[PDB]
Design a protein around this nucleic acid. Sequence first.
RNA 1: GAGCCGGUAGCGGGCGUGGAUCCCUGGAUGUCCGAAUGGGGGAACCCGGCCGGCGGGAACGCCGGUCACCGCGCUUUUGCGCGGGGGGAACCUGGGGAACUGAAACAUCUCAGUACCCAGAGGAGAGGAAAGAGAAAUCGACUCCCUGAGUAGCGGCGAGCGAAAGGGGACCAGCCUAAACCGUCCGGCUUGUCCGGGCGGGGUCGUGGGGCCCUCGGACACCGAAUCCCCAGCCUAGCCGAAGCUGUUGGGAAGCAGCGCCAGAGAGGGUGAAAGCCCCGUAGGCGAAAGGUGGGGGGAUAGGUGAGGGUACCCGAGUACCCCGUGGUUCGUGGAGCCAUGGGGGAAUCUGGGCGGACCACCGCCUAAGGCUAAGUACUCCGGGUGACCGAUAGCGCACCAGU
RNA 2: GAGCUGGGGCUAGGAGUGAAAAGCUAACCGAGCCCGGAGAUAGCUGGUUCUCCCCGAAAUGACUUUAGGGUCAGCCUCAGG
RNA 3: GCGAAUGCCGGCAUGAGUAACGAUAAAGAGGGUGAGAAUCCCUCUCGCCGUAAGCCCAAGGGUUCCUACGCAAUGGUCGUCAGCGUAGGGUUAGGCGGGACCUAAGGUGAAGCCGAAAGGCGUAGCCGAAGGGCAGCCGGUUAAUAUUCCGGCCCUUCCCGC
RNA 4: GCCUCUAAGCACAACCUGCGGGAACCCGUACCGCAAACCGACACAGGUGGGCGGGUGCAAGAGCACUCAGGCGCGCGGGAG
Lengths: 73, 76, 64, 110
Amino acid sequence: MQKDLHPKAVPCKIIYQGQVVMETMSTRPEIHVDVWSGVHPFWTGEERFLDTEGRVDKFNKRFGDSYRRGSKK
Amino acid sequence: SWDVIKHPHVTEKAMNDMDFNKLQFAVDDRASKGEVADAVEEQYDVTVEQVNTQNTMDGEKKAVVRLSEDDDQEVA
Amino acid sequence: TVLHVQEIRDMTPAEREAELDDLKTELLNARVQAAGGAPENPGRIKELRKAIARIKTIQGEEGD
Amino acid sequence: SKQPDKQRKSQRRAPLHERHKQVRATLSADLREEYGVRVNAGDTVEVLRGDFAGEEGEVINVDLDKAVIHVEDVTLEKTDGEEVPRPLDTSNVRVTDLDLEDEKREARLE
RNA sequence: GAGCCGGUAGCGGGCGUGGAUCCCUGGAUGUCCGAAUGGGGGAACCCGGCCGGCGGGAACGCCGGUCACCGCGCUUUUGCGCGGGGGGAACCUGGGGAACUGAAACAUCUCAGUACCCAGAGGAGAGGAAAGAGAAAUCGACUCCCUGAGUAGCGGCGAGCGAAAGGGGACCAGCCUAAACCGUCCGGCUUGUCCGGGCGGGGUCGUGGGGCCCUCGGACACCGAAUCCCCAGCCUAGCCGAAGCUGUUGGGAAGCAGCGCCAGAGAGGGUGAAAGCCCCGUAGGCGAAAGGUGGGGGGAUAGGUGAGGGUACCCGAGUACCCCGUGGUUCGUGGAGCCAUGGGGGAAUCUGGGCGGACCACCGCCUAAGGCUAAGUACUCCGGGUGACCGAUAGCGCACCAGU
RNA sequence: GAGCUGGGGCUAGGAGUGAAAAGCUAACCGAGCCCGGAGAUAGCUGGUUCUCCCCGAAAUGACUUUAGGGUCAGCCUCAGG
RNA sequence: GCGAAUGCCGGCAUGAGUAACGAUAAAGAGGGUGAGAAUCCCUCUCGCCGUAAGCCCAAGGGUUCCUACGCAAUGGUCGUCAGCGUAGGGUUAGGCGGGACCUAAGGUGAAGCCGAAAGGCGUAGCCGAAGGGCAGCCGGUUAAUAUUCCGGCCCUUCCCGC
RNA sequence: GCCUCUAAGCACAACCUGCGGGAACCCGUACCGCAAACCGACACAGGUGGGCGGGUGCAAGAGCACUCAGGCGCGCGGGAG
């Protein structure tokens, strides 16, 4: 576990898949894709209880970063 | 920690070995010259003469004590 | 049947020891013995062994 | 002990004395009738079956071990010659002279 | 309760009713490997500090004991004292997660969220007092069995997939904390009125909590534990335990004959060929302990909450709600919601704020964005019971020096 | 001598390596091998058991990614009117 | 309820007393032992090696090695022979080799760095070899061992004392 | 290993040397070993790394013919042709 936020999780899942609409606005739709991928934020440098730096991403990051709910800066 | 050595390995040679010199026996295997010798030493009058070693596929550990220029008793 | 706990237990540590030393010794004697092919069946052999056994037994318990 | 085989399981695998349980029986008139509580084992009696049936003898050896005993009388000789005590099928076993000359024998069964 | 040194029957020797073999339970040893963890390593081997006897050191000096891996709290000081990890047939939830094959092709779909892998909890986890369900202003935890129903319904409307409230049943069962309001302080900024963390207030079950003013009121309300012995159940051995003998064909009888008894125990099995009465330590039936684990149940422990109105009011969360992109759901892009979230905007503290399937008015429900919760269902490694279940090419493949 | 070689190791099996034919990857790799999906599907192929009674078939027609399948008919059989 | 599935499992016949003896480097004779010897032991002719059909170090295999008994099966015939059976016994090192020393590849790997989890990488340090390094040799001696056992000759490191 | 030295302690006791006494382990060896004892399931004319490889003759040489030391006659023998 080394790709999340610290101040909460947000990684994983992701069942994408494209098609060729054309519905309600007349006739019916169609299907295709069948893949799976990722989806997340980014991480910055901080620190806690003797150095540590942290990581976690935006959102959250905007938070605790501002504040700090287990270790500040 | 307790006991010490084993017993008197007995055979054609040995027999003739402990005879003439030295003395061959069943040596637990553990203990070596060190820990070995000793035992001998404490047990059998004569002191820490010398020695060599050996084991084998069998169970037993072969050991030898060249003589103290003194006693040993044919039949140990 | 014989010897026995407590009693022997009054046989202070120092002794407890010494007493064993010999302990083996004899036994040990027993061995050479066997190999020898002379003597016969030493219920003793065993026993002795054991006795000694317990021996330590108690002892230890005693708290070494 | 509620099935066929749990008999070999608490008789011989368990307390061998359970096999004593086997040395169980009675004997002559006296003693018996008198009761039947407090045995002796290597007592005397006189089977009651097998050619040897209706015979006179005594209790030689508590063999519980083998699952039965031996009766000096009851026996046979080899073929090389020498005689010998036969196997005592626990089954047909009779005891009347309830070995009890030994105070400890009379302090248990008769 | 009177025989034994295990399967070895054999030689040679021996312990035993001034309670041996063995059955129990709690012990002391437990060599080397193996998470290994003192250090190294092709496991079961080879290497190091401290104490240690002091030990043959015949007029000459060693094994033993020991000890210490690393991630976890944190009495922080120089950190001293607690937990973990490795297993484990099957079963459990999460994390991740597929083609065959059906559709008589095959791209949608199916097999499925299956098979497998991973992590981890347990002896059971799963889940669990509702921003729930639905609409008779009706219901209320969660779970599981039947039913609802192969219905309402999803869909190249094709193969298929296929809910739920309500009724019947097993069980019952309820509680907490931030939740700055009050006071306590401790530490800061730097003295005020700031944030801070330990103490209580309250510490919300179905709307309340505080703070103020007057009525208060002045003893039976135990939970998931906590506790005492109680029947602690079992833990292996506990032990009594009804009643026939003669005669006989027989190598053997318990058979054929004659008389005789039992009886809540004619369950079966062993007995030289088929016994209720010969053996059976069996069902008859009563028995039984000083140690290892319960409910029932007795008590205090009892932890713990438990009444009245008023007032302008401040107090269960950081993201609800909305846009796009997926989930689960019976919903396969659909008139398509609820709950869950990948990115971006980023509200309110009781006329607040979601909800009853686009939305809107009105009505009706509920009060989130922290947590604990035995019992009712699953699973057999283990032990027992029972068989219109098998007999050595059947049964587990393997009935005994076989996963060899 | 892009020489032959022992010993020590590194890569790996939809991926490796390959002075490159699809070669070699524990003696048959045009995509290894074992356990698992799983007893995959399999108009094709076989295989498909004791006696006896009763009657008695089709090898055409219609539509099929259907033609050596199978739907519906036509010809069989038994129960009642 | 079965011939019958080139069915599965087991036995049992075929061809068949023909096909084969695993290199065309050949033997033959005298004596000896034994119940019994073309196939064993001694001996005497003879043939084949000879760069081997030599001794040696390794790696691999592990008692197969010797000695006394024995041949049931394995020895593609025998067999008193065996690298077959049972029993007993055999291999000893301050200086030879491995460690108690060193690192490259590579592998590990406190810190550090990234994964949905399992994991990936990886500094220093460590693991890692007939590469580096290190103190001896010749004769004798049993049924087997030997630079270890004998003895004669040559050494090294640690320790205490002065 | 040899020399340079901090920390640092020796610096009448640290290292070099000299003589005398004292100490020296753990595991490996048999025999096979261009092989019936090693891989080919077998006493299978297949492969397997290093050391001079004795001589006489051939221009030389681990090529060759005979043989030294040591090894062996192939593990089935006769008999017709």
